[PDB]
């Protein structure tokens, strides 16, 4: 399976990840270790490695790119958790609670620094153009998301843009950068690139679905956390639209008037309306991106590496397939 072939590399990047976090500073080392210890599926290094294996070539750059992408990913998590007040991280407590605010913000910048250090060896402007551009896009998406809190309506284009920047682009950068550090065929680079984009889009939709459909156990936080923090997502958008087809715009009215001080009763109503009217269309959307990802995988040369990607595509999108 994919865990079999990547196993040797996974432990290698994991080893290097711990090397990168070492610090003559006591707290930072502890803090960096704290989040690196947490259960991460290391899905991004996986996409990097597999991207470089699409063509025959061995490079030190490949595995060290995977390391930097993880460090960046984790840097955003530490900052995110503090910003969004998320006190728990998959069973383990988050950095700002286990230490403090100052350590939380320092550790994030520290992880980013080391991540940048790790790839400073790659003398390639295009590589840095892509990576620095995606990091910027992530930031940009965060600004808009923050401004969209409790601001209805949120256009369909703005939503796609939001989930693209917040989840899709980084995964796409994993496939893009992984392909660069192996001089991959351009037509083949386009397909693994678009695959990374589509899989990320699909995954983030599913996650937006689960916020409404799953239990606080699989979520690690209350059901309907997005809307309670002001985030208007496609499931809600789709539910409102369906209700309007039945000549019922009460949900629209409510969401329009929703503010940060709204009552729990209003949220419970929204959540149940979404479960009843907004789930199917969101699943349908997610499936479109899932299918599109399949196409891009099918347009690249038949090989062993193709099968691994195809198997991970099945797992990550289990909720829709």
């Amino acid at each position: 399976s994919y865990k079999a072939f990547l196993n040797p590399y996974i432990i290698e990047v994991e080893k290097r990840l711990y090397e990168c976090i070492q610090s003559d500073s006591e707290t930072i080392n502890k803090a960096a270790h704290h989040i690196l210890s947490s259960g991460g599926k290391r899905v991004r290094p996986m996409f990097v490695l597999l991207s470089g294996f699409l063509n025959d070539t061995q490079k030190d750059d490949l595995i060290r790119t995977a390391v930097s992408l993880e460090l960046v990913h984790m840097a955003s998590l530490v900052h995110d958790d503090y910003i969004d007040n998320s006190d728990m991280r998959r069973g383990n407590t988050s950095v700002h609670i286990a230490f403090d605010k100052d350590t939380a913000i320092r550790t994030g910048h520290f992880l980013l620094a080391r991540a940048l250090q790790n790839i400073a060896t790659i003398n390639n402007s295009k590589f840095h153009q892509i990576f620095s551009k995606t990091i910027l896009e992530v930031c940009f998406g965060e600004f808009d998301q923050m401004a969209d809190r409790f601001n209805y309506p949120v256009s369909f284009t703005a939503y796609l843009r939001r989930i693209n920047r917040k989840t899709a682009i980084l995964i796409e950068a994993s496939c893009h950068l992984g392909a660069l550090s192996s001089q991959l065929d351009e037509q083949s680079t386009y397909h693994i690139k678009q695959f990374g984009h589509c899989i990320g889009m699909s995954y983030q939709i599913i996650d937006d679905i689960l916020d409404y459909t799953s239990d606080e156990a699989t979520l690690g936080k209350p059901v309907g956390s997005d809307i309670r923090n002001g985030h208007i997502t496609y499931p809600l958008m789709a539910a409102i639209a369906n209700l309007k087809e039945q000549d019922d715009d009460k949900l629209e009215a409510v969401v329009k008037h929703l503010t940060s001080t709204s009552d729990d009763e209003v949220y419970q109503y929204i959540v149940s309306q979404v479960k009843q009217y907004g789930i199917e269309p969101a699943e349908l959307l997610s499936r479109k991106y899932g299918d599109k990802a399949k196409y891009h995988l099918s347009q690249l040369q038949d090989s062993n590496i193709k099968d691994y990607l195809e198997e991970i595509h099945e797992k990550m999108l289990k909720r829709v397939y």
Binding site: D24, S25, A113, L116, Q117, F131, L136, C139, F140, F143
Partner: protein, 135 residues
């Protein structure tokens, strides 16, 4: 105002105009004066001012401004990385990214020390972090 200062201010003013949650604080005056006379390219000077302002923003972050300030320090860090990417300034990149991890390390250790001369000195090292390697 130097050429490089117009460049960064133009981009920062464009961000504030576009993203209401981006907060642009004033650049450190002393750091500007020094950077003005640094023997490096326009792009490196922008990166320096970007990352210097980024780290100084850390100290102003509360619960009342975190959904603004945190993200703002993060774009400033990203801009820092952008400025040194095309063309890629390998040496400046190796040096300044080192400064980033080190300044966070110094600030962490600074928290657990009350000694006068020890605090005066570490603060000095922190305040001149990104400009020393060029002097």
């Amino acid at each position: 105002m130097m050429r490089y200062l117009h460049k960064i201010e133009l981009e920062l003013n464009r961000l504030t105009s576009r993203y209401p949650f981006f907060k642009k604080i004033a650049f450190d005056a002393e750091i500007i004066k020094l950077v003005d006379d640094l023997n490096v390219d326009e792009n490196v000077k922008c990166a320096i001012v970007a990352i210097d302002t980024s780290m100084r923003m850390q100290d102003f972050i509360n619960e009342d401004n975190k959904d603004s300030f945190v993200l703002s320090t993060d774009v400033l860090s990203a801009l820092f990385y952008k400025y040194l990417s095309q063309p890629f300034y390998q040496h400046d990149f190796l040096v300044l990214t080192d400064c980033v991890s080190r300044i966070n390390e110094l600030k962490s250790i600074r928290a657990t020390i009350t000694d006068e001369i020890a605090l005066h000195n570490i603060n000095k090292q922190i305040h001149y972090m990104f400009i020393q390697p060029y002097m």
